[PDB]
Design an enzyme around this catalytic site. Sequence first.
Site, PDB file in Angstrom:
ATOM      1  N   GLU B 121     -58.677  41.642  16.527  1.00 23.88           N
ATOM      2  CA  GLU B 121     -58.943  40.752  17.650  1.00 23.88           C
ATOM      3  C   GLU B 121     -59.168  39.321  17.196  1.00 23.88           C
ATOM      4  O   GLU B 121     -58.824  38.383  17.924  1.00 23.88           O
ATOM      5  CB  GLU B 121     -60.128  41.279  18.469  1.00 23.88           C
ATOM      6  CG  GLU B 121     -61.378  40.428  18.460  1.00 23.88           C
ATOM      7  CD  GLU B 121     -62.437  40.940  19.432  1.00 23.88           C
ATOM      8  OE1 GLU B 121     -62.552  42.175  19.589  1.00 23.88           O
ATOM      9  OE2 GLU B 121     -63.140  40.107  20.050  1.00 23.88           O
ATOM     10  N   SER B 175     -67.588  38.962  26.235  1.00 22.98           N
ATOM     11  CA  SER B 175     -68.720  39.819  26.578  1.00 22.98           C
ATOM     12  C   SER B 175     -69.923  39.439  25.715  1.00 22.98           C
ATOM     13  O   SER B 175     -71.003  39.130  26.227  1.00 22.98           O
ATOM     14  CB  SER B 175     -68.337  41.297  26.404  1.00 22.98           C
ATOM     15  OG  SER B 175     -67.190  41.642  27.200  1.00 22.98           O
ATOM     16  N   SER B 178     -68.509  35.797  19.254  1.00 22.62           N
ATOM     17  CA  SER B 178     -68.133  35.778  17.847  1.00 22.62           C
ATOM     18  C   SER B 178     -67.982  34.333  17.396  1.00 22.62           C
ATOM     19  O   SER B 178     -67.441  33.498  18.126  1.00 22.62           O
ATOM     20  CB  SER B 178     -66.817  36.537  17.593  1.00 22.62           C
ATOM     21  OG  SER B 178     -66.973  37.939  17.753  1.00 22.62           O
ATOM     22  N   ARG B 190     -65.570  35.558   9.976  1.00 25.04           N
ATOM     23  CA  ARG B 190     -66.514  35.644  11.090  1.00 25.04           C
ATOM     24  C   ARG B 190     -67.889  35.309  10.527  1.00 25.04           C
ATOM     25  O   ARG B 190     -68.506  36.129   9.845  1.00 25.04           O
ATOM     26  CB  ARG B 190     -66.479  37.033  11.725  1.00 25.04           C
ATOM     27  CG  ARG B 190     -67.258  37.169  13.031  1.00 25.04           C
ATOM     28  CD  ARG B 190     -67.191  38.599  13.569  1.00 25.04           C
ATOM     29  NE  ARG B 190     -67.702  38.735  14.936  1.00 25.04           N
ATOM     30  CZ  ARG B 190     -68.971  39.023  15.233  1.00 25.04           C
ATOM     31  NH1 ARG B 190     -69.858  39.180  14.259  1.00 25.04           N
ATOM     32  NH2 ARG B 190     -69.357  39.153  16.501  1.00 25.04           N
TER      33      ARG B 190
HETATM   34  C1  LIG Z   1     -65.921  40.821  18.606  1.00 21.16           C
HETATM   35  C2  LIG Z   1     -66.436  42.224  18.325  1.00 21.16           C
HETATM   36  S1  LIG Z   1     -66.989  42.913  19.911  1.00 21.16           S
HETATM   37  O1  LIG Z   1     -65.907  43.054  20.887  1.00 21.16           O
HETATM   38  O2  LIG Z   1     -67.439  44.298  19.729  1.00 21.16           O
HETATM   39  N1  LIG Z   1     -68.169  41.862  20.535  1.00 21.16           N
HETATM   40  C3  LIG Z   1     -69.405  41.545  19.847  1.00 21.16           C
HETATM   41  C4  LIG Z   1     -70.014  42.430  18.954  1.00 21.16           C
HETATM   42  C5  LIG Z   1     -71.218  42.076  18.342  1.00 21.16           C
HETATM   43  C6  LIG Z   1     -71.788  40.849  18.627  1.00 21.16           C
HETATM   44  C7  LIG Z   1     -73.109  40.439  17.997  1.00 21.16           C
HETATM   45  C8  LIG Z   1     -73.053  40.251  16.496  1.00 21.16           C
HETATM   46  O3  LIG Z   1     -72.123  39.773  15.950  1.00 21.16           O
HETATM   47  N2  LIG Z   1     -74.193  40.688  15.740  1.00 21.16           N
HETATM   48  C9  LIG Z   1     -75.314  41.267  16.365  1.00 21.16           C
HETATM   49  C10 LIG Z   1     -76.544  40.410  16.143  1.00 21.16           C
HETATM   50  N3  LIG Z   1     -76.733  40.171  14.684  1.00 21.16           N
HETATM   51  C11 LIG Z   1     -78.035  40.054  14.099  1.00 21.16           C
HETATM   52  C12 LIG Z   1     -79.115  40.704  14.704  1.00 21.16           C
HETATM   53  C13 LIG Z   1     -80.368  40.558  14.083  1.00 21.16           C
HETATM   54  C14 LIG Z   1     -80.426  39.790  12.917  1.00 21.16           C
HETATM   55  C15 LIG Z   1     -81.768  39.620  12.209  1.00 21.16           C
HETATM   56  N4  LIG Z   1     -82.753  39.488  11.688  1.00 21.16           N
HETATM   57  N5  LIG Z   1     -79.362  39.219  12.418  1.00 21.16           N
HETATM   58  N6  LIG Z   1     -78.175  39.350  13.011  1.00 21.16           N
HETATM   59  C16 LIG Z   1     -75.489  39.730  13.964  1.00 21.16           C
HETATM   60  C17 LIG Z   1     -74.275  40.569  14.342  1.00 21.16           C
HETATM   61  C18 LIG Z   1     -71.181  39.975  19.518  1.00 21.16           C
HETATM   62  C19 LIG Z   1     -69.985  40.325  20.129  1.00 21.16           C
HETATM   63  N1  LIG Z   2     -63.064  37.561  36.943  1.00 24.39           N
HETATM   64  C1  LIG Z   2     -64.020  37.658  35.945  1.00 24.39           C
HETATM   65  N2  LIG Z   2     -64.542  38.880  35.870  1.00 24.39           N
HETATM   66  C2  LIG Z   2     -65.467  39.197  34.970  1.00 24.39           C
HETATM   67  N3  LIG Z   2     -65.930  38.306  34.110  1.00 24.39           N
HETATM   68  C3  LIG Z   2     -65.461  37.064  34.121  1.00 24.39           C
HETATM   69  C4  LIG Z   2     -64.480  36.705  35.050  1.00 24.39           C
HETATM   70  N4  LIG Z   2     -64.160  35.412  34.878  1.00 24.39           N
HETATM   71  C5  LIG Z   2     -64.875  34.943  33.900  1.00 24.39           C
HETATM   72  N5  LIG Z   2     -65.697  35.919  33.413  1.00 24.39           N
HETATM   73  C6  LIG Z   2     -66.605  35.726  32.297  1.00 24.39           C
HETATM   74  O1  LIG Z   2     -65.805  35.960  31.130  1.00 24.39           O
HETATM   75  C7  LIG Z   2     -66.490  36.870  30.243  1.00 24.39           C
HETATM   76  C8  LIG Z   2     -65.465  37.712  29.475  1.00 24.39           C
HETATM   77  O2  LIG Z   2     -64.680  36.831  28.659  1.00 24.39           O
HETATM   78  P1  LIG Z   2     -63.614  37.490  27.656  1.00 24.39           P
HETATM   79  O3  LIG Z   2     -63.245  36.450  26.617  1.00 24.39           O
HETATM   80  O4  LIG Z   2     -62.383  37.930  28.424  1.00 24.39           O
HETATM   81  O5  LIG Z   2     -64.411  38.711  26.982  1.00 24.39           O
HETATM   82  P2  LIG Z   2     -63.873  40.118  26.451  1.00 24.39           P
HETATM   83  N6  LIG Z   2     -65.153  40.783  25.594  1.00 24.39           N
HETATM   84  O6  LIG Z   2     -63.495  40.925  27.613  1.00 24.39           O
HETATM   85  O7  LIG Z   2     -62.671  39.900  25.422  1.00 24.39           O
HETATM   86  C9  LIG Z   2     -67.405  37.716  31.156  1.00 24.39           C
HETATM   87  O8  LIG Z   2     -68.565  38.109  30.428  1.00 24.39           O
HETATM   88  C10 LIG Z   2     -67.802  36.696  32.250  1.00 24.39           C
HETATM   89  O9  LIG Z   2     -68.907  35.904  31.812  1.00 24.39           O
HETATM   90 MG   LIG Z   3     -62.375  39.223  23.617  1.00 22.76          MG
END
Ligand SMILES: CCS(=O)(=O)Nc1ccc(CC(=O)N2CCN(c3ccc(C#N)nn3)CC2)cc1
Ligand SMILES: Nc1ncnc2c1ncn2[C@@H]1O[C@H](COP(=O)(O)OP(N)(=O)O)[C@@H](O)[C@H]1O
Ligand SMILES: [Mg+2]
Lengths: 352, 352
Positions: B121, B175, B178, B190
Site C-alpha cells: 500500500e 482510517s 502513516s 515508514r
Molecule cells: C497503513 C497500515 S493500516 O492500513 O493497517 N493503517 C494503520 C495502522 C497502524 C497505525 C498506527 C501505527 O503506525 N502505530 C501504532 C501506534 N504506535 C506506537 C504506540 C505506542 C508507542 C509508545 N510508547 N509508540 N508507537 C506506532 C505504530 C496507523 C494506521
Molecule cells: N464518503 C466518505 N465516507 C467515509 N469516509 C470518508 C468519506 N469521505 C472522506 N472520508 C474520510 O476519509 C477517511 C478515509 O480515507 P482513506 O485514505 O480512503 O483511508 P483508507 N484506510 O480507507 O485507505 C475516513 O476516515 C473519513 O475521515
Molecule cells: Mg489507505
Amino acid sequence: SPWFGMDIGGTLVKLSYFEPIDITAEEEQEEVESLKSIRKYLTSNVAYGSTGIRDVHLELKDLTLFGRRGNLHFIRFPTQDLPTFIQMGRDTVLCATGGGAYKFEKDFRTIGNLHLHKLDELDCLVKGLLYIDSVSFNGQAECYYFANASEPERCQKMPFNLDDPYPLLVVNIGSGVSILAVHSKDNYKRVTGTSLGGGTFLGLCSLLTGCESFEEALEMASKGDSTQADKLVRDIYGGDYERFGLPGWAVASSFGNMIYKEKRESVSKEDLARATLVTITNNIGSVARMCAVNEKINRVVFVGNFLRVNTLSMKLLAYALDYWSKGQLKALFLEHEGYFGAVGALLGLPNF
Amino acid sequence: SPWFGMDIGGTLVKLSYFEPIDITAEEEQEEVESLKSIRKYLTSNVAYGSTGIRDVHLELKDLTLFGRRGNLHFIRFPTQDLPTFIQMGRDTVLCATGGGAYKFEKDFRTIGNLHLHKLDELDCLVKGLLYIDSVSFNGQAECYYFANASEPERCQKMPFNLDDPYPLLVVNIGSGVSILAVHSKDNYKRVTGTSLGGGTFLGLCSLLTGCESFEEALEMASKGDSTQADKLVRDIYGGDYERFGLPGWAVASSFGNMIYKEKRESVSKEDLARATLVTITNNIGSVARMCAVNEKINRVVFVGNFLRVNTLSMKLLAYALDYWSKGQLKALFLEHEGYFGAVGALLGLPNF
Ligand SMILES: CCS(=O)(=O)Nc1ccc(CC(=O)N2CCN(c3ccc(C#N)nn3)CC2)cc1
Ligand SMILES: Nc1ncnc2c1ncn2[C@@H]1O[C@H](COP(=O)(O)OP(N)(=O)O)[C@@H](O)[C@H]1O
Ligand SMILES: [Mg+2]
Ligand SMILES: CCS(=O)(=O)Nc1ccc(CC(=O)N2CCN(c3ccc(C#N)nn3)CC2)cc1
Ligand SMILES: Nc1ncnc2c1ncn2[C@@H]1O[C@H](COP(=O)(O)OP(N)(=O)O)[C@@H](O)[C@H]1O
Ligand SMILES: [Mg+2]
C-alpha cells in the site's frame, strides 16, 4: 510562617507542607495560636472540607530541610475549589507555580500581607523531581519501572536508580502534556507538548459514558474491551501488516469501528472508557518515543496525575514504549508523581 | 482486459480506471460485449449503485499510458460495499493494494479466471504520487499550498513545484495515519504512524453528535466553536505562557473543559464536531512536525481522504505547521489526494 509549596494547575492544586518536628519548648510558647491551629488542622485530618485530600502514604518523614527536621506532607484539591481555600485563608510567604499562580495572583493578594512569589511550572517540576529522588522515599527508591514489561507473567514493579539523572526525558501528563529534555540541573528545554492529556481522558469519558469522577472512569475502563471501539490492523489486513512490522493487534484507527452504526449500538460504556484510556495513553507513548529518539535520550520518566491510581496506563506505557522502540527505551515512573512542582516551589523559599 | 488499479482501504475502496480513447475500427469489432458494456457503464454514469461515485473533476484526459492514449478516471466506494462490487463482477488481471487486497483475496478469486496481484500500500502510494505529479493535472500543478497561511486576509491556494521531489515527508491520513520519508524513487521508509486519523474523527463525531456521514460531520464542525469544549492556555494561565512561547489561544487540553458538568450541559453538537476535527488535525500536524524535524525534511505533503472536501483541516494544517515550526516547514497538498495507491497499483500492471 508555615512553609508551603503550591502548584495550581489547570485541574488540580497540589500543596507540599513541611511540618517541623524539632519544635523546642520555647518555640512552642512563641508560636501564634493561628499557626498552631493550622498545623493541628493539617496533621489531624486526612480530608479537608469536601474535596481536599492528604496523600498520607507519600509523606516523607524526618526530612532535614532548611536546617530543620520535619515531615513533608502532600495535599491536593481541585483548582475549581481554590476560592474556598482562599476564603478559609482570609479568616505569610507563598511560593506558587503552575498557571494558576498567574491567573489567581490577584485572589491570593486578598489575603492581607501575603507575599506571593510566582515560579515557573517546569523549573519547579525539574527541581522538585531531582530533590525527591535525591532524598529517597523514606529509604526506598523514588523511581521504578515495570521489569519484563513484554511478558505479563513476569511484569512486576522494580526499583530504578537515578543517581546520575542525566540526560532524562520527563513527560508531564496533567490537563495536557508537556515533554521536557533535562540535560543538567540548570539545563533543560520543553521539547514539545500535546493537548491530548489527562483532561482529554476525563472530558471524553464524561461525554461518552457519563462518568463523573476520574476514579470511576478508570473503574469503567478496567471492565471494558477497547477493541469493540477501535479498528485494528487485523480488521484491515486480516492479520499482521508484515512489510512494516505492524502486528495484527495494533490499533489502526482509534474509535474507528464507531463509524458503523451497528457497532455504535452494541458498544458498552466500559468499552468506550477503555478505548479512551488506550487512545490517550498510546498517543502519549508514541509522542514520548519520537522525542526520545530525536533528543537521543533513552530514559523516559512519566509524571503528572493522569497516572495516579492508574496502573492500567502505566503498564500500557511500560509495554508500548518497550515494544515499539524494540527495547531501546525504558518507561520510568515516580512514587510522588503529581507533586514535583509543589515541592520545587517550596524549595524556592530561601530566595525570599 | 480493462486496466484497473484498486486500493482497498480500511474505510474506502479507491479505483483508477484507464479508458482508451484511441480505439480503432478493428479493435472495436474485436471487443467483447461485456467489455463494451463495462466501459459504457463507467463512462455513462457518475453514480454507481447507491454508494459508488466517480470524481469527474479529477479525470486526467489524453494521458499516454502503456503506449495508448486515454482518460484516467477516479472512482470510490465504501469498503463495506465491496461484496456488492464483487457480486456484480461475477455476473481479468487486477492489481490491488491496501489491506483489503489481503483480507479479501479469497473473495476476489470467486471471480472466475481473475488474476489477483497484491502490491504494497505504501509502495503504491509513492509510485502513484510521483506519477500524477509528473504528468500534471491536465497541465495544472498537482501540488499546492496555502500562501501566507498565518494571515487570513492573504491565505490563498497557490501552486507548488515538485519537479525535484526529494526528500519528501508524506503524511497519509486515512482510517489511521502513516508517515513516510521519501528519499528517492526506490528509497523510502515508514517513519511511524498514529491511530488518531480519519476514522477517529468520524467515529468520535458519530458517538458525540449522531452525525451519519463524513460530509455532515464537516458541516457541523464548520458551524461549531471548538473552544467551548477545549481548555486553552489562557484558561489555565490567564493569558500567554510566555516562558515557553505558548500563546493564550493554544489548546492546553482537548475536550478538557468537558470535565465540568455545567460545560457539558451547554456545549452544542456543532462545538463537539469542531473540537473533534481540531483535536485530530492538530495532533497529526504535531506528529508530522516532529517527524520532519527528525528526518531533516522541510516539505510535508498531506494526502488521504480525511482531507477531501475538508478545507477546514487543510487550512488548520497549513497554519499550524507554519506557526509551530517558526516557518521552517511547509504544508503541501495534492489535488488527487485519496487516489495515489490506486494509481500505483495500476502502474504495476506491466509486471504481469
Ligand atoms: C497503513 C497500515 S493500516 O492500513 O493497517 N493503517 C494503520 C495502522 C497502524 C497505525 C498506527 C501505527 O503506525 N502505530 C501504532 C501506534 N504506535 C506506537 C504506540 C505506542 C508507542 C509508545 N510508547 N509508540 N508507537 C506506532 C505504530 C496507523 C494506521
Ligand atoms: N464518503 C466518505 N465516507 C467515509 N469516509 C470518508 C468519506 N469521505 C472522506 N472520508 C474520510 O476519509 C477517511 C478515509 O480515507 P482513506 O485514505 O480512503 O483511508 P483508507 N484506510 O480507507 O485507505 C475516513 O476516515 C473519513 O475521515
Ligand atoms: Mg489507505
Ligand atoms: C504546561 C503549560 S499548560 O499548563 O498551559 N498545559 C499545556 C499547554 C499546551 C499544551 C500543548 C502544546 O504544548 N502545544 C500545542 C500543540 N502543538 C502543535 C500543534 C500543531 C502543530 C503542527 N503542525 N505542531 N505543534 C505544540 C504546542 C499542553 C499542555
Ligand atoms: N481527583 C482527581 N480529579 C481530577 N482529575 C484527576 C484526579 N485524579 C487524577 N486525575 C487526573 O489527573 C489529571 C491532572 O493531573 P495534574 O498533573 O494535576 O494536571 P494539572 N494541569 O492540574 O497540573 C486530570 O486530567 C485527570 O486525568
Ligand atoms: Mg501541572
